[PDB]
DNA sequence: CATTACGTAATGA
DNA sequence: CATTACGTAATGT
């Protein structure tokens, strides 16, 4: 009957949506980790370049 | 007290709504953090390049 | 107490 | 079809 096949299609889609949202969350936390170490390396670079500018003698 | 099953269910349904609200807010705040770090890394990269061009200009 | 998989029905327009 | 909120039950996330 149509009811059971519509329900099974949705039951499959709800699982798929949930697995996909779990995937995006892992990917988003990865992204926060990569952007944060990039941020820290860029800050080290700025500090080091600023210090050279500030102490250049010629 | 009487009907402990319904007491526990009523309290758990509260915990569940609370947990789901919090998870949504954690999700928002994480996306905002990605935005923030992305725009800050952009700013930091322009700074590295503008400092570098200044050193290049001064040294040769 | 907080967290999460499950099936369902509504939303989406 | 994809997404979301719900209440339940199991479980220590």
Residue numbers in the entry:
A (entry chain B): 283 to 340
B (entry chain A): 281 to 340
Task: Give the original sentences from the paper that presented this experimental model.
This finding was further confirmed by our structures of C/EBPα and C/EBPβ in complex with the TTACGTAA DNA. Our ITC results showed that C/EBPα and C/EBPβ bound to the TTACGTAA DNA with a Kd of ∼0.354 μM and 0.018 μM, respectively, which were 1.4- or 3.8-fold stronger than to the TTGCGCAA DNA, i.e., the reported consensus binding sequence of C/EBPα/β. To understand why C/EBPα/β prefers recognizing the TTACGTAA DNA, we determined the structures of C/EBPα and C/EBPβ in complex with the TTACGTAA DNA, respectively. Surprisingly, our binding results showed that C/EBPα bound to the TTACGTAA DNA of ∼8- to 20-fold weaker than NFIL3 and C/EBPβ. Structural comparison showed that the shorter side chain of D320 in C/EBPα prevented it from forming additional hydrogen bonds with N321' in the other monomer, unlike E111 in NFIL3 or E309 in C/EBPβ that formed a hydrogen bond with N112' in NFIL3 or N321' in C/EBPβ from the other monomer. Mutating D320 of C/EBPα to E enhanced its binding affinity by ∼5-fold compared to the wild-type C/EBPα.
pmcThe CCAAT/enhancer-binding protein (C/EBP) transcription factors belong to the basic region-leucine zipper (bZIP) family of transcription factors, which play crucial roles in tissue development, cell proliferation, and differentiation. The bZIP domain consists of a basic region (BR) and a leucine zipper region with a sequence of heptad repeats. The leucine zipper region is responsible for the dimerization of the bZIP domain, allowing the bZIP proteins to form either homodimers or heterodimers.
